[PDB]
Design a protein around this nucleic acid. Structure first.
Length: 66
DNA sequence: GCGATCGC
DNA sequence: GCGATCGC
């Protein structure tokens, strides 16, 4: 249970990896949707600032069909 | 502006 | 099927 830290509209936010729904790479933005206690949203961080657990989630998603 | 993607 | 997010 690691927390992903990201900036959204200037604010500092955090979401546990277990709340992440979908992860993808848009350019160098590791992007993701999540549902945090009813709050559905989207976040993104640079690949260079993403925690290993998020990158591993990303690799698992890149392995599957589109 | 572009990338990938979903809310609405 | 745009508008919207971030990183670049």
């Amino acid at each position: 249970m690691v927390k992903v830290k990201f900036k959204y509209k200037g604010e500092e936010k955090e979401v546990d990896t277990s709340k992440i729904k979908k992860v993808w790479r848009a350019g160098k933005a590791v992007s993701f949707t999540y549902d945090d206690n009813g709050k559905t949203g989207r976040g993104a961080v640079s690949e260079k600032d993403a925690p290993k657990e998020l990158l591993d989630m990303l690799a698992r998603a890149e392995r599957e069909k589109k």
